[PDB]
Amino acid sequence: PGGVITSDMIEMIFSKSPEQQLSATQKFRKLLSKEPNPPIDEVISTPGVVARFVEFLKRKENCTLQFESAWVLTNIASGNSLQTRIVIQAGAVPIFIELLSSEFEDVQEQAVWALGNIAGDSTMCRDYVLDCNILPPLLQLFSKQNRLTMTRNAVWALSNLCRGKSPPPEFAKVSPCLNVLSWLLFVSDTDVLADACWALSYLSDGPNDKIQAVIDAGVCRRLVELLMHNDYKVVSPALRAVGNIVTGDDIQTQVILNCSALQSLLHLLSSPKESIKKEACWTISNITAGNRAQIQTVIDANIFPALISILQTAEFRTRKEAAWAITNATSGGSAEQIKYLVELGCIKPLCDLLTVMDSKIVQVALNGLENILRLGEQEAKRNGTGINPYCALIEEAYGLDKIEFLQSHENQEIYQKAFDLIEHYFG
């Protein structure tokens, strides 16, 4: 040390002989295949050695050597940014791209691998790889539905192109993949479906026109159907994508609802997996922040008893989302609709939230209780009686205590709200 890579490896790598070049390359490749810690730093630190591999990519008469070399560079291009920058600076990218078109399958595959690593390193590496025109010849690769490892690599690499919100890729540079992507949803392989959902979630993760674009490739129905997939690998990203699409306006969200998503979301509300329940709650909250009919479609899917049961039984991350789901409904609902929520028993679970640390949740819960008190006030005048039906009910859930306790809470808006509510609705 140094010399934990052969003196002879340098000698062979740099020789005239193709056999020795390959032999050394193989040693490199196996050492970089090492699970615990591969010698990335040592390799990068012998100064013409990367460049040599990059030149070996150019050897169109040699399948093996091209392949092993792409493998070596694939691994250096794994893990960190500083080791990846060396591969970029030796100009490996245009070469790998040109290698997307090689007559060799193995080379084609490994090259898409390495490019996936490089694009997945950072934002500027991502755009740098788009700028070198990876898309056309990458997309071209799906046109042979025969080979699986290649298709996995490609969607995988592709989701790296779409990934990253800071800044997002230039949409126009990335939105050409929507076709391939929509129809890869009908394929059978778990990994392929998973990455195509990742990719579709990254692309739906933005403003309404980007969502529109995802909607127009018609993936919604597949995406909603994949919520029922047996493998979590597929369900999470699909859940994200559907989750992202429903951040749009009411029309865009309607498209998801027209695919009968709610019935699947309800199912997901019982997932063993907490992140799934959490994500399904959040998706629901964005549906119950829509118009009266959407709220009502959530009522009729029987979603609300599961949300309430979630508020009572689940992790605080999860319950936050259920809580938003319920208060949004009280905010956009008809009187009959809020009566339904009260009759279900949403009052106590809101009142229990009032004493948690997260101030927003407290606000959320107060917002919903306000909304309910407001409808009840509106009722005391339609009917004869001048008593608010929800006053006694909020008191009975120890909600009244919590709200007074909240007058001495440190937060300004909290104490104020609690004060105005006591004054407006309690005696």
Partner: peptide
């Protein structure tokens, strides 16, 4: 409204 929410590790080494 919009938003845990984390992702797969972006890089993958070829092993074995």
């Amino acid at each position: 409204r919009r938003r845990s929410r984390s992702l797969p590790l972006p890089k993958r080494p070829r092993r074995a």
